[PDB]
Amino acid sequence: VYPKALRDEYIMSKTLGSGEVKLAFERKTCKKVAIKIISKNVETEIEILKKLNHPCIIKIKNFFDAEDYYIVLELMEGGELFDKVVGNKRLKEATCKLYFYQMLLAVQYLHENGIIHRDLKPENVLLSSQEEDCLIKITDFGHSKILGETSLMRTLCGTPTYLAPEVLVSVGTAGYNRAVDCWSLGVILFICLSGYPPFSEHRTQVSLKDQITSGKYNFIPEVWAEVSEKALDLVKKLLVVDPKARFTTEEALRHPWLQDEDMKRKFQDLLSEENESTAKPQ
Amino acid sequence: VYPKALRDEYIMSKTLGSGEVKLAFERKTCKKVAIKIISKNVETEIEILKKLNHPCIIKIKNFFDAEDYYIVLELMEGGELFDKVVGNKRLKEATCKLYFYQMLLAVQYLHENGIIHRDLKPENVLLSSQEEDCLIKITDFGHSKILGETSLMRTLCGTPTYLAPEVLVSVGTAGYNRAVDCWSLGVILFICLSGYPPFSEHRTQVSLKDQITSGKYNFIPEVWAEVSEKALDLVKKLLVVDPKARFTTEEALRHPWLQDEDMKRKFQDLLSEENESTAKPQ
Ligand SMILES: C/C(=N\NC1=NCCN1)c1ccc(NC(=O)Nc2ccc(/C(C)=N/NC3=NCCN3)cc2)cc1
Numbered sequence: 018v019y020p021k022a023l024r025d026e027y028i029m030s031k032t033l034g035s036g037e038v039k040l041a042f043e044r045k046t047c048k049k050v051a052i053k054i055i056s057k058n059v060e061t062e063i064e065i066l067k068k069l070n071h072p073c074i075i076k077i078k079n080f081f082d083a084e085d086y087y088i089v090l091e092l093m094e095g096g097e098l099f100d101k102v103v104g105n106k107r108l109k110e111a112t113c114k115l116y117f118y119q120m121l122l123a124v125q126y127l128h129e130n131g132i133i134h135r136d137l138k139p140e141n142v143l144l145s146s147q148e149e150d151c152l153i154k155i156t157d158f159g160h161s162k163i164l165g166e167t168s169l170m171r172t173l174c175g176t177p178t179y180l181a182p183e184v185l186v187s188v189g190t191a192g193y194n195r196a197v198d199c200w201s202l203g204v205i206l207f208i209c210l211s212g213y214p215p216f217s218e219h220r221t222q223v224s225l226k227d228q229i230t231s232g233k234y235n236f237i238p239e240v241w242a243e244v245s246e247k248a249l250d251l252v253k254k255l256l257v258v259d260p261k262a263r264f265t266t267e268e269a270l271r272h273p274w275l276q277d278e279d280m281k282r283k284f285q286d287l288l289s290e291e292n293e294s295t296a297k298p299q
Numbered sequence: 300v301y302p303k304a305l306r307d308e309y310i311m312s313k314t315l316g317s318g319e320v321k322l323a324f325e326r327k328t329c330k331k332v333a334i335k336i337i338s339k340n341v342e343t344e345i346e347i348l349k350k351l352n353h354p355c356i357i358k359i360k361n362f363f364d365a366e367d368y369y370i371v372l373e374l375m376e377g378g379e380l381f382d383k384v385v386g387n388k389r390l391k392e393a394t395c396k397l398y399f400y401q402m403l404l405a406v407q408y409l410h411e412n413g414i415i416h417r418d419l420k421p422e423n424v425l426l427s428s429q430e431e432d433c434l435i436k437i438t439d440f441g442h443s444k445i446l447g448e449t450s451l452m453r454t455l456c457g458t459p460t461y462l463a464p465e466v467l468v469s470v471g472t473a474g475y476n477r478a479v480d481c482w483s484l485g486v487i488l489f490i491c492l493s494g495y496p497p498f499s500e501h502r503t504q505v506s507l508k509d510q511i512t513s514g515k516y517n518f519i520p521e522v523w524a525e526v527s528e529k530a531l532d533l534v535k536k537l538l539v540v541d542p543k544a545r546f547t548t549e550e551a552l553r554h555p556w557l558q559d560e561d562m563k564r565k566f567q568d569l570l571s572e573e574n575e576s577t578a579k580p581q
């Protein structure tokens with residue numbers, strides 16, 4: 018059964034997806050919520066999500082630590098982005114841009130606040146409505162990590178008389194862990210624009226691993242002919258194998274493909290619609 | 300002042316070294332102890348040290364979490380190994396071997412139990428008496444780390460469709476973090492045998508960093524002429540720059556230099572002397 022403290026505040030309803038996500042109604046307000054059930058690092062995910070405040074990142078409404086974990090969240094009526102890209106379905110380039118812009122803003126906000134998501138995937142991008150133009154929110158912070166003062170920094174404060182060479186070599190590449198999120202964004206954007214994954218074991222002899230470490234994405238010219246050169250250019254700068262040369266979220270946001278004032282206006286318009294609100298002075 | 304709970308059990312006395320280490324007497328037994336004062340990860344060090352049971356690893360007797368941290372430990376009357384190797388003083392090769400054998404046993408025991416020390420240095424090797432033949436104990440677990448289930452293992456359980464190349468590349472070298480302890484042991488052994496450090500900014504133009512990552516130790520043939528070829532051979536196998544080719548503690552313990560039954564008998568003899576005891580059946 019559901020725990021009593023949850024039943025106290027919420028009436029539970031039908032499954033929305035699957036881990037498992039259920040529809041519920043908050044008794045106090047009679048408004049719909051979603052309740053993620055995680056069968057029994059969740060404490061950390063909760064703590065991370067409670068501190069973050071961004072319109073493209075999902076907010077926690079409540080939490081119950083019972084026989085399983087129950088996380089109450091805002092209901093995202095559009096479901097998962099995954100459902101929009103399966104079956105080689107693909108979005109209009111304009112829609113890809115709106116969604117990707119928001120993903121970039123979200124991930125930029127995470128990285129500024131010392132958080133790496135580490136599991137960015139279409140399944141973890143939720144749409145706020147069934148309309149094609151809508152807000153997206155990033156979810157599922159179960160693999161996420163907090164950037165802080167490292168043991169490396171502490172190690173490098175002394176003289177390395179006794180220090181191993183591999184530690185000194187790792188200084189070259191440290192502090193670029195956040196770049197794994199930009200690679201994922203790149204893969205997501207590729208999928209959204211083309212309707213197929215860049216690295217896959219479908220109709221090829223190269224191993225998935227070897228595809229990825231070489232950076233050799235599967236390019237099918239006629240799927241891409243309809244897509245703009247600027248869109249593909251950005252994809253190329255995100256799917257760079259060297260994490261230090263890979264585009265950051267800031268660099269992606271400055272890319273020509275995202276200098277689209279129509280898209281940006283539509284995003285601001287959707288934000289205003291969402292928000293309610295409170296009177297202001299002057 | 301000292302905290303009341305400490306004063307309750309112990310009478311405090313003179314400084315033994317410096318962090319700071321004081322002599323004290325346990326009131327109950329009238330026997331000497333050492334009290335490490337760490338001015339305000341210690342919780343973890345305590346938890347690690349409480350679980351470990353080896354004659355060459357220092358034991359915690361008591362702990363007080365007051366305005367500073369106070370860790371009560373067995374008194375090691377010989378002091379630090381550092382004091383035996385400063386001023387280009389060097390130990391008899393036979394004594395180096397006895398001490399190094401014990402360090403190896405200690406570090407082997409740590410690695411079998413999923414602990415890496417990460418700060419092995421002459422300062423953290425304590426001698427049990429002022430006699431040249433004595434027991435040693437490794438101390439100071441403030442930088443130590445617990446090997447466990449990694450985020451890498453979890454990441455590799457799914458299909459890496461969205462996974463970044465650098466993660467896949469790091470699989471090649473993961474799980475060799477323990478090898479930094481073997482490099483330190485190598486540096487320690489070098490110092491003990493020769494009376495000088497292998498990597499240093501003394502009378503050279505090569506940077507310390509460049510000395511270490513190239514593995515080019517400073518070899519002065521006439522300091523070493525008196526040292527056996529087998530001793531130096533082991534040093535060479537520990538100061539290997541590739542962490543995967545570096546000798547492990549097991550490989551070091553199988554090295555010809557440590558197949559010395561006289562040395563091993565002396566170690567067992569010193570162990571028996573230390574222990575007291577309890578009657579046994581049959
Ligand atoms: C509108 C909709 N579907 N529409 C359709 N379906 C049925 C009938 N109509 C919908 C379907 C699924 C979701 N899922 C969701 O929000 N999921 C979600 C999952 C996980 C998390 C979090 C924070 N997970 N964290 C966690 N996962 C593993 C370990 N950490 C947040 C939201 C939201 C909406």
Ligand SMILES: C/C(=N\NC1=NCCN1)c1ccc(NC(=O)Nc2ccc(/C(C)=N/NC3=NCCN3)cc2)cc1
Nearest residue numbers: 315316320333335375376377378379425438439440441
């Ligand atoms: C016999 C002796 N000196 N003799 C001589 N001197 C004066 C008069 N005669 C002596 C001197 C110093 C020590 N130190 C010691 O045990 N130190 C010790 C230090 C730290 C720790 C630990 C567990 N530290 N952990 C901690 N350090 C930093 C963060 N974590 C344990 C033992 C022991 C014995």
